[PDB]
């Protein structure tokens, strides 16, 4: 039996899915919005997303036949009660929380990035760490609707929470793109330079991040919705946009053991030079540099 949170989630799913507010939802739309890769069995690896679609067929076929190829919120709620009942048998500690998570993941509900629809692997506000701070993401967009992207062109040097809510979805990890039909664009060979990402928040004043988009991205292949935000560093400097402070994360997979030899040398050398001079004028008492 669904309690308040799952009831709210299933109602939101049904409402967002029925754009006409008629309480009558098409099975083809059920297949379109069914994120079958979110099935717990599919995530485990013993089920196919197509098999999830066909078990959805099994669950809804007779009701669709009764209601002329359409589904009512009452039967949707009955389906979700059956899902919640099945969720008890599954082995997680928190059955209820597993239920909200499964419902949201299946029906594409929750903190979903507006432009493309990618759900963040980790919360947007927190700065990236680990693979989320080292591995490059895929620059994605929506074209009339198909999602199309370019691999490994965005550095993870910035927090996605600082972006406008209408621009976050263009940036997404392969973790997030997993399970989504993503067309791909071959990048264009070019030297290793990085385009910025700037947007306008007031007349004459702009904000953005510096050097996150690789120059391998083809501007012509980019849609007009992203060409206005992607720009060259010289253009951004002349435009005088505000820079959000990003963090440069060094790749450790290529950290030579000998690279650790020379860390702190500059600061220690400055301190020892100060010690040397202070001894030379003679203000130094105690530990004295002897030459």
């Amino acid at each position: 039996m669904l309690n308040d949170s799952e009831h709210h989630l299933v109602d939101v799913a049904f409402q967002s899915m029925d754009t006409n507010n008629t309480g009558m939802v098409s099975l083809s739309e059920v297949k379109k919005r069914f994120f079958a890769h979110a099935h717990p069995r599919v995530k485990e690896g013993s089920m196919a997303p197509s098999a999830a679609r066909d078990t959805l067929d099994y669950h809804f076929g007779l009701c669709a036949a009764d209601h002329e190829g359409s589904i009512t919120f009452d039967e949707f709620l009955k389906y979700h009660e059956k899902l919640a009942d099945e969720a008890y048998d599954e082995h997680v500690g928190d059955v209820a929380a597993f239920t909200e998570k499964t419902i949201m993941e299946l029906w594409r509900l929750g903190d979903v990035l507006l432009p493309t629809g990618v759900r963040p692997a980790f919360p947007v506000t927190q700065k990236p760490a680990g693979l989320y701070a080292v591995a490059l993401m895929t620059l994605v967009w929506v074209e009339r609707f198909v999602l199309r992207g370019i691999k490994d062109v965005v550095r993870p040097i910035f927090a996605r929470g600082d972006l406008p809510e209408e621009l976050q979805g263009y940036f997404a990890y392969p973790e997030e793109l997993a399970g989504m039909a993503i067309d791909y664009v071959a990048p264009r060979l070019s030297i290793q330079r990085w385009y910025d990402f700037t947007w306008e928040y007031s007349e004459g004043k702009y904000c953005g991040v510096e050097g996150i988009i690789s120059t391998r991205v083809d501007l012509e292949s980019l849609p007009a919705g992203l060409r206005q935000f992607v720009c060259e560093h010289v253009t951004a400097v002349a435009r005088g946009t505000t820079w959000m402070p990003t963090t440069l994360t060094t790749n450790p997979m290529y950290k030579k053991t000998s690279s650790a030899y020379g860390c702190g040398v500059n600061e220690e050398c400055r301190k020892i030079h100060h010690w040397k001079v202070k001894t030379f004028e003679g203000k130094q008492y105690g530990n004295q540099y002897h030459g």
Partner: protein, 431 residues
Amino acid sequence: MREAICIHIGQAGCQVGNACWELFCLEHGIQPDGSMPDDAFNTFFSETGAGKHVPRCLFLDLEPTVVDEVRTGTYRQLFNPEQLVSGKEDAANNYARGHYTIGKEIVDLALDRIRKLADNCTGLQGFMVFHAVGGGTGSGLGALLLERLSVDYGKKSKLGYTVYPSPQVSTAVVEPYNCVLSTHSLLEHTDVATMLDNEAIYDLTRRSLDIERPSYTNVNRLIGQVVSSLTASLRFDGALNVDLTEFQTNLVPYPRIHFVLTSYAPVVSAEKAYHEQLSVADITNSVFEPAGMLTKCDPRHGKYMSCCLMYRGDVVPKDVNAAIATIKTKRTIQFVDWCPTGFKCGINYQPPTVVPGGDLAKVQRAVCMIANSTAIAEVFARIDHKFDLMYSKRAFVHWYVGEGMEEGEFSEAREDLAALEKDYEEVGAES
């Protein structure tokens, strides 16, 4: 004046010299760029009118990865494009090839660079070669370069820091072959040789520095520290300044008895450092105990023959004398009968400087020991037995004989090492 030319042969020589040069730059206040942000650096850094200080070293490896690592790293602006020689193909764990075939094609330019460095220097005290006798290019090219240096520069002092194969850990199987074959060069054309095996330093790091996962970086840093403690007398002021020839004479009693063991105190981490009062007596006892030994050679098993102490910091000669008298009184270690004094000590006011990124704790006083001891016979009496097992069944000898070396050279090197063991046992014999 007072220059000392450094040589870094083979991979191990390259990393050891890397650590040594980083520590020297930190000691003298030189940036990795080469400019400082008192002519106390001329002994390691060649002064130039541009404000830079080119190091007085020769990196030399027959394979290019380590020298290219140096050419890529933080010391690009410090290290000269030359004095950083790269080969084309490594000797690859083959003494015969490293000393015979691909060694002659590079020793000429190596000697050219050496002559350039010597001409740049004016009062060169001596050469300081760093290598591991286990490695192919290391052992072979070090042997050949030391032959050339001995036949060219005459009786100039040559101090070698050799990473001998350890009793149990060894990264090569023909390493006993390379060790026994390079022993002949290390005995005749090397003025002093110093054991720097890896097990002892690993154990010292895991005991004192409290490093559960020690690597070559810590070992190289300890080697740099002991080398700096050796050269601090000629780099900085001190109560009893000692030169290369000074401790040379006071350390080598016979032309063949020059292989020496080293130890350092106080080796300790920062967290455990302030809980202990690092007095002169305490550091001397820590040195004389086998725990602080940088070699897998227990001095209790033999008799001390000559000891050299490099004192650094606020050590006072009275405390030095009290500590050495206490060591004489102590029974757990005994000296050879014919050398009653047996102690050389050189005091310096300069305290050691800890390299950031390392693990040594800063200390107000430190001491290094370089010792000729009769117990040194055990490392060689272990390596020859290590070698004989392979040599009996003629394993791996075809690689060495196919690179221009006679099979009798193995027997000649074994006989030389046997004589070395014999006279190590003979010098300690009671009168």
